[PDB]
C-alpha cells in the first residue's frame, strides 16, 4: 500500500513522553482547581452489548432518571454533586438497576457537602 505520496505525511510519535507529561500537568491543574471534588464523575456500572463482550461489565456515561429517582435524589440536583445523569439510557435489567441504586446510595453516604454559602 505505497501507491500514494505517504512519504509526505509520516507521523512519528516522538512526543509521547511530552504529551504524557502535559496530560499529568493538566490533571494537576484540574485538581488544584477541583481540589475538593474528584477529577472524574461517578460513572455507573453497565453491561456491554455485542454478545461477544456481553460477559464483560464496564462503566457507562451516567445513571438513568429512574436510577436517580430510586437513589433518593433528583437528576438536576445529582449533577451538582458530580453524579453523571443520562436522559436517554433506558433501564432493562433489574440486577443492573439494583447495583446502580446501591452504588448511588453508597456514593451519597461517602460524599460530604459543604455549606452553599
Amino acid at each position: 500500500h505505497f501507491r500514494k505520496h505517504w512519504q509526505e505525511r509520516v507521523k512519528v510519535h516522538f512526543d509521547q513522553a511530552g504529551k504524557k507529561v502535559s496530560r499529568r500537568n493538566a490533571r494537576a491543574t484540574r485538581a488544584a482547581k477541583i481540589a475538593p471534588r474528584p477529577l472524574d464523575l461517578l460513572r455507573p456500572v453497565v453491561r456491554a452489548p455485542t454478545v461477544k463482550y456481553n460477559r464483560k461489565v464496564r462503566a457507562g456515561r451516567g445513571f438513568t432518571l429512574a436510577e436517580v429517582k430510586a437513589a433518593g435524589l433528583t437528576a438536576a440536583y445529582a449533577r451538582t454533586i458530580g453524579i453523571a445523569v443520562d436522559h436517554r439510557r433506558q433501564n432493562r435489567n433489574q440486577e443492573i438497576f439494583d447495583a446502580n441504586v446501591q452504588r448511588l446510595k453508597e456514593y451519597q453516604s461517602k460524599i460530604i457537602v459543604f455549606p452553599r454559602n
Partner: peptide, 8 residues
C-alpha cells in the same frame, strides 16, 4: 472514583 489504570 473509577478504577485507575495500572496498579497503584
Amino acid at each position: 472514583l473509577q478504577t485507575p489504570a495500572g496498579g497503584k
